[PDB]
Design a protein around this ligand. Structure first.
Ligand SMILES: [Zn+2]
Ligand SMILES: [Zn+2]
Ligand SMILES: [Zn+2]
Lengths: 258, 258
């Protein structure tokens, strides 16, 4: 049977092709994860259908209902068989779903509009003229919410109460906000995305400072899935074969416009 | 009852305390992995005994013998219950043992004696005056032996047939070889070790070029071990709390000698 793959529209991982309207099924999309999905399906020998997560979220647990949303939720509730996307491996998620060994290593980073007086997280936490936030329902927000280290704790105190909200529904929303904020907004996102955007027109943003942490993205499957073991070994094989590095260069810098 | 931990004497992961002779059991050792072992044990709730792998190797399968050596072997044959060391997560190993999500991210790198006319792997591959090799029975050697990309394949072709042998039994042996060869030997080792040595007197070595690949170290347990699940969650928990980053700073830079 065809494996239902849940993913998210997030460049350069998954994007609709220029001529998607005249295309069908998986042919409508392109990106790092689209290529990854094809490679995995081939090595594990299965047919699949790419589907875009309904609520457009990565995955967080509602504190009140305890119900998971996003791709994590689609896996938890059996709406999808596997998630192939820039989904971060975290403790709370690992408790409800399975992750393969990472196919990409990254960390939380700072995105600024070129020229803003900020070079590090400590710099952001020591000022108020420049607002900053993170994506909603994700691992980055959880990071600051659950951080006991001085700098990040203070940043969270400011962000969780900030009015208007400094949080955004999608990476694209955060990037747009930085660009149109005349430098009065900094966005906290994973280095992978920061580095990608930094290489795209109008080439008006840049990553500053070192990453705040070190983690990875993993292919996720529901607990007790029969694809879990194989997919995990497939990821390792692809990394060692050099495919993952090949794909990283293909979608990040070979297509860079800055 | 008491969990037997296999590890390896590799600075700054595990080292004998100056006064180990007058100490007992686990107190005889110090290092990044010693600190990590204590934390993993505390969080998983078990007592443990640190033991140094008999053959001083990380782990590889003998071609014809088909027997696994090193720490991997101690786990495969039931001599140890868990391995806590800078053991690389690889496909061939994950096929016989379990690995937690990575506790450290790294990649193969190049170590040169300062002043050596080498800036990358391509540079090494295009010349012959400077010999270069890797560690034995490990993931680095296997990386080159299996590589299908031009540059690395060329490097392997040279290394495998070079005489005298360009390979070494221990990291320390490779570092000394670099330090004593007057720039005529470059050593290929993981970035973590390269970065550490670069901060050690006589401060005569340096890491050059970008990493050749991207992977990580994981805590290993025998396949089907009852400790696997908890250890994995412990690693994620500890990484998210910043312990891992704190530990690397403690053993790498806080104690830097350069
Ligand atoms: Zn392939
Ligand atoms: Zn609610
Ligand atoms: Zn602890």
């Amino acid at each position: 049977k065809t494996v239902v793959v849940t993913t998210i529209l997030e460049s350069p991982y998954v994007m609709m092709k220029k001529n998607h309207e005249m295309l069908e099924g998986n042919e409508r999309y392109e990106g790092y994860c689209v290529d990854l999905a094809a490679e995995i399906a081939k090595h594990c020998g299965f047919k699949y259908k790419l589907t875009i997560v309904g609520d457009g979220k990565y995955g967080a647990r509602d504190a009140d209902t305890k119900i998971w949303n996003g791709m994590v939720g689609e896996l938890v509730y059996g709406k999808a068989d596997i998630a192939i996307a820039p989904l971060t491996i975290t403790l709370v998620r690992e408790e409800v779903i399975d992750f393969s060994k990472p196919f990409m290593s990254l960390g939380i980073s700072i995105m600024i509009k070129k020229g803003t007086p900020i070079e590090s997280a400590e710099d952001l936490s020591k000022q108020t003229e420049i607002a900053y936030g993170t994506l909603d329902s994700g691992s980055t927000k959880e990071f600051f919410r659950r951080s006991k280290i001085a700098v990040f704790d203070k940043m969270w105190t400011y962000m969780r109460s900030a009015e208007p909200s400094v949080f955004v529904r999608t990476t694209a929303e955060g990037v747009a906000r930085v660009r149109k904020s005349k430098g009065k907004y900094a966005y906290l996102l994973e280095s992978t995305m920061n580095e990608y955007i930094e290489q795209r027109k109008p080439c008006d943003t840049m990553k500053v400072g070192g990453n705040l942490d070190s983690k990875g993205y993993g292919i996720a499957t529901p607990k007790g899935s029969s694809l879990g073991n194989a997919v995990n070994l497939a990821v390792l094989k692809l990394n060692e074969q050099g495919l993952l590095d090949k794909l990283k260069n293909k979608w990040w810098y070979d297509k860079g416009e800055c």
